[PDB]
Design a protein around this ligand. Structure first.
Ligand SMILES: CCCCCCCC/C=C/CCCCCCCC(=O)O[C@@H](COC(=O)CCCCCCCCCCCCCCC)COP(=O)([O-])OCC[N+](C)(C)C
Ligand SMILES: CCCCCCCC/C=C/CCCCCCCC(=O)O[C@@H](COC(=O)CCCCCCCCCCCCCCC)COP(=O)([O-])OCC[N+](C)(C)C
Ligand SMILES: CCCCCCCC/C=C/CCCCCCCC(=O)O[C@@H](COC(=O)CCCCCCCCCCCCCCC)COP(=O)([O-])OCC[N+](C)(C)C
Ligand SMILES: CCCCCCCC/C=C/CCCCCCCC(=O)O[C@@H](COC(=O)CCCCCCCCCCCCCCC)COP(=O)([O-])OCC[N+](C)(C)C
Ligand SMILES: CCCCCCCC/C=C/CCCCCCCC(=O)O[C@@H](COC(=O)CCCCCCCCCCCCCCC)COP(=O)([O-])OCC[N+](C)(C)C
Ligand SMILES: CCCCCCCC/C=C/CCCCCCCC(=O)O[C@@H](COC(=O)CCCCCCCCCCCCCCC)COP(=O)([O-])OCC[N+](C)(C)C
Ligand SMILES: CCCCCCCC/C=C\CCCCCCCC(=O)O[C@@H](COC(=O)CCCCCCCCCCCCCCC)COP(=O)([O-])OCC[N+](C)(C)C
Ligand SMILES: CCCCCCCC/C=C\CCCCCCCC(=O)O[C@@H](COC(=O)CCCCCCCCCCCCCCC)COP(=O)([O-])OCC[N+](C)(C)C
Ligand SMILES: C[C@@H]1CC[C@@]2(OC1)O[C@H]1C[C@H]3[C@@H]4CC=C5C[C@@H](OCCC(CO)CO)CC[C@]5(C)[C@H]4CC[C@]3(C)[C@H]1[C@@H]2C
Ligand SMILES: C[C@@H]1CC[C@@]2(OC1)O[C@H]1C[C@H]3[C@@H]4CC=C5C[C@@H](OCCC(CO)CO)CC[C@]5(C)[C@H]4CC[C@]3(C)[C@H]1[C@@H]2C
Ligand SMILES: [Ca+2]
Lengths: 92, 92
């Protein structure tokens, strides 16, 4: 579940923030939001940053349309596969 | 699950609110938010109170960077261990 977390956070930060200097904040940002998605937080108005109801309208830029597809795959793997695999692990 | 709740609420209130007089509101605040986290509410914009998108920007202060780590551990224990232990209890 932690490798799936990093498989999503690194491209999302890379696509949405293309103009970053090296900083230890990059370690925070690739882990932070994808972790809280395991626990119910979809960040509904930060998906599709180029939409009209977005709370991150300045992050809209070249290629940020990829991130809704990335997050759809992420949560399918996390809730629908890995959380239910973990329920099933405990039962048996 | 109730002791894990108090193991998290007391330090979060202590770290984020260091200048409190004795009041019965302290009994409320160490229980209130950690309980609603069991039920889907991550309080996404109150995590990392020193961030730019925070809804509690005046709570930023010395040592408030500890609370995202505390809440990550809390919800791992609550959903991923204790809720699934309770699903498994009912099944068997
Ligand atoms: C629930 C616990 C996880 C939570 C963290 C707390 C851990 C608490 C304690 C846990 C007890 C440890 C259990 C046994 C393992 C022993 C040490 C070890 O690492 O060994 C393995 C090497 O490790 C690897 O091959 C992978 C190393 C990556 C670890 C990164 C942690 C990511 C999860 C972090 C969470 C991210 C959350 C994001 C997703 C929600 C190999 O195993 P071994 O050494 O051969 O020993 C195995 C058994 N034996 C002795 C019979 C051989
Ligand atoms: C999975 C992959 C993860 C990534 C790996 C790489 C990790 C590299 C880590 C690098 C950390 C060091 C770089 C920063 C230097 C300190 C200054 C700093 O940033 O201060 C900030 C807090 O942050 C801290 O004080 C540091 C946080 C320390 C804990 C980091 C955990 C790393 C390992 C895991 C251990 C976990 C425990 C369990 C272990 C078994 C304070 O500033 P601010 O918050 O920005 O707020 C600004 C406003 N203010 C001035 C009012 C404050
Ligand atoms: C024991 C079992 C093993 C656990 C696994 C490993 C644990 C993960 C370890 C991660 C390493 C830690 C990442 C932070 C790096 C340092 C941050 C820093 O220097 O500055 C930041 C401080 O911010 C913080 O100190 C808060 C960090 C975020 C909380 C992480 C919660 C854990 C979620 C994940 C848990 C699952 C992880 C899944 C693994 C893939 C801010 O940046 P700054 O430049 O200081 O200031 C910017 C100013 N600004 C804020 C105003 C904009
Ligand atoms: C689902 C129910 C819990 C919900 C609350 C409602 C309770 C409803 C009713 C429940 C019926 C009671 C079942 C049996 C126990 C009898 C009384 C008792 O306490 O006995 C135990 C002492 O108690 C302790 O050792 C711990 C005391 C702390 C209780 C605090 C409540 C926290 C949960 C609150 C929720 C926080 C939620 C936060 C997390 C989500 C010892 O047991 P005993 O006395 O020896 O008897 C056991 C069996 N015997 C007779 C065979 C020996
Ligand atoms: C787990 C650890 C928990 C902590 C333990 C310590 C507990 C100590 C408890 C202390 C309560 C007494 C102190 C306050 C005095 C009354 C005045 C007051 O605050 O009024 C407020 C409401 O609140 C109340 O009226 C009181 C709430 C009573 C229920 C508390 C449950 C305690 C035990 C559990 C029983 C649960 C049932 C199940 C039992 C089996 C009204 O004011 P306000 O809301 O601020 O709004 C202001 C605006 N206004 C003026 C328009 C209103
Ligand atoms: C039966 C089975 C056992 C159950 C277990 C024990 C139950 C827990 C018992 C907790 C004790 C009660 C805590 C409140 C204390 C009194 C509040 C007070 O005096 O004032 C507050 C009134 O606020 C309220 O009256 C609302 C209290 C919060 C709701 C609690 C929901 C239960 C969540 C947890 C359930 C799981 C608990 C898990 C256990 C760890 C406000 O403060 P004030 O100073 O009056 O005014 C401030 C003004 N202001 C509001 C404008 C800012
Ligand atoms: C393939 C599956 C079936 C789908 C069929 C239908 C789709 C066909 C497939 C792919 C469509 C690719 C082009 C679409 C972009 C058009 C709009 C656009 O300009 O967007 C952006 C650029 O976008 C680019 O420059 C494209 C970047 C390359 C993407 C590499 C493959 C992505 C899919 C993975 C590989 C596929 C396999 C994945 C596994 C399933 C916007 O940037 P801009 O142009 O500068 O806009 C102005 C911005 N400004 C105003 C801020 C300055
Ligand atoms: C250790 C695990 C691996 C992590 C490695 C990397 C991290 C290395 C470890 C720890 C880093 C500790 C220092 C980081 C703070 C730097 C930034 C800073 O100033 O932050 C705060 C102060 O912070 C303090 O004064 C530190 C408080 C002591 C923390 C005690 C241990 C915490 C971790 C538990 C023990 C560890 C074991 C836990 C089990 C895993 C900000 O306060 P300030 O300075 O006044 O800022 C100005 C504020 N003003 C503008 C509002 C006025
Ligand atoms: C197998 C996994 C692949 C992904 C990953 O885990 C292992 O690989 C790790 C390597 C880390 C980087 C290493 C070095 C630096 C340089 C530093 O430079 C200080 C700049 C400035 C501070 O303000 C000086 O003042 C900033 C941080 C950065 C870029 C790390 C970011 C996180 C990274 C990408 C980690 C990530 C979670
Ligand atoms: C084993 C567990 C350890 C944690 C815990 O449970 C048991 O221990 C309990 C003890 C409680 C405190 C006892 C006394 C007071 C003094 C009172 O003084 C009136 C001030 C003002 C009112 O406005 C006068 O006007 C304010 C409340 C406070 C600090 C309690 C807070 C909650 C505490 C910390 C409880 C907490 C849930
Ligand atoms: Ca939910």
């Amino acid at each position: 579940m932690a490798l799936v977390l990093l498989s999503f956070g690194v491209p999302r930060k890379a696509i949405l923030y293309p103009h970053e200097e090296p900083s230890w904040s990059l370690a925070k940002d690739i882990v932070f939001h994808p972790y809280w998605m395991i626990f119910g937080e979809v960040y509904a108005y930060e998906i599709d940053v180029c939409a009209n109801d977005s709370t991150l309208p300045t992050i809209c830029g070249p290629g940020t349309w990829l991130t809704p597809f990335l997050q759809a795959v992420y949560l399918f793997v996390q809730y629908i596969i890995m959380v239910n695999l973990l329920i099933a692990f405990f039962n048996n």
